[PDB]
Amino acid sequence: EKIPCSQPPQIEHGTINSSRSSQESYAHGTKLSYTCEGGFRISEENETTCYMGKWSSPPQCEGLPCKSPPEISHGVVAHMSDSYQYGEEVTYKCFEGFGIDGPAIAKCLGEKWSHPPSCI
User: Fold this and answer.
1) CA proximity to 40, closest of 17, 58, 66
2) What angle do CA 4, 14, 102 make, to 5 degrees?
3) Which neighbouring-strand residues pair with 5?
4) Do residues 69 and 106 both lie within one domain?
């Protein structure tokens, strides 16, 4: 007997738009609509569905102008632009006395960025 779901998932930078705060749990075969931060544009029908207590990936919100890359603790992007519009990448450098991980980038997602550099 299908498990109900809990607080719907979050889109990279969004939340559910199903009667704000009414319920905590949802049923199985439950499809709620979605909404993202002020500005963001949502593509591919703003709806999510619930199966066995697990939710499916939300819609895809983005379309928003992002800011320049964020700054970091162990690296620094010197090759950053001024007009970075969502879903774009930058590459920072490392410092001295640090080691390296995987990506020495930061990736924007409509507003801020993702996985900042690999120099820890």
Assistant:
1) 66
2) 100
3) 26
4) yes
